[PDB]
């Protein structure tokens, strides 16, 4: 137990994947679909309304106009009324 044989140095065994990978951990590209055609969406953009069923609530960090997750949509009859008494319908 005094000695520690089999030092087993690791050099190119970790370089073999690439050198910038051992300084920066790289990024994950999304999966490409077919019905989506060629619109390569990323993981930090959403310009359409989503559905909030058993999903997570997204967060925003700066600028970059985004869509939303619809929680309630309803149509009723538009009653006549303003912020006052002027209610002419002639």
């Amino acid at each position: 137990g005094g000695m520690t044989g089999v030092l087993f140095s690791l050099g190119a065994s970790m370089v073999l994947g690439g050198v910038a990978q051992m300084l920066a951990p790289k990024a994950r590209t999304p999966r490409i679909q077919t019905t989506d055609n060629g619109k390569q969406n990323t993981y930090f953009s959403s310009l359409d309304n989503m559905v909030a069923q058993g999903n997570v609530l997204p967060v925003l960090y700066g600028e970059m106009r985004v869509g939303s997750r619809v929680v309630s949509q309803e149509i009723s009859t538009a009653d006549e009324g303003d912020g006052g008494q002027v209610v002419v319908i002639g």
């Binding site: 069923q53 058993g54 997570v56 997204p58 967060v59």
Partner: protein, 232 residues
Amino acid sequence: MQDIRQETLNECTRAEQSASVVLWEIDLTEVGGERYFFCNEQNEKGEPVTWQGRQYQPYPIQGSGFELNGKGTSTRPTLTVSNLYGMVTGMAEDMQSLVGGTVVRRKVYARFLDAVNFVNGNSYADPEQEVISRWRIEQCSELSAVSASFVLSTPTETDGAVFPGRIMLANTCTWTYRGDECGYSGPAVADEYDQPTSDITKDKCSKCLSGCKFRNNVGNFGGFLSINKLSQ
């Protein structure tokens, strides 16, 4: 850089090294236990090693595989402790197999221990020169009737955790009771199954709409009342 004092770094240059000593502290206050002090070896008087005034008792402890890295997996060093007379099993049967506790490893050089460890008395003592690491116990991979092996991990390691903790629900709350969002501080009114009780030891919300209506905090409900978004 490390928080290494000048004196110990200067001493760690010469050829004739002193004896390296490793001491371990198992802290279980955050989980419901006590602080245990262990050392792999005792002094020349056959006494527990005295450091900074406190005492570390002798017990067979061995830590192997401390590998700090930035890529690949995390670090999982292994701590081996002799389980004789059932001493480890005693706390394991009580403290839920030592899961969630903290371990602190301090390494010191021999020439800096307290003077009471030497018959002549060390004149170079300085109880402020040591190297400190901390880890958390992850699992007890094997505890037999002769030994016990614990796996260690970094406190900040992420595994099985998701980033957007928010979850959209229909008729179930998402947070705890009375913690920060349920600003309720009145008398106990409900229990697990929404029964009209007035005892504080059994007051736990049912995580429903009825519980909120009972507690008059429906304005602070986490469950959005959508439900019928997929039917249409």
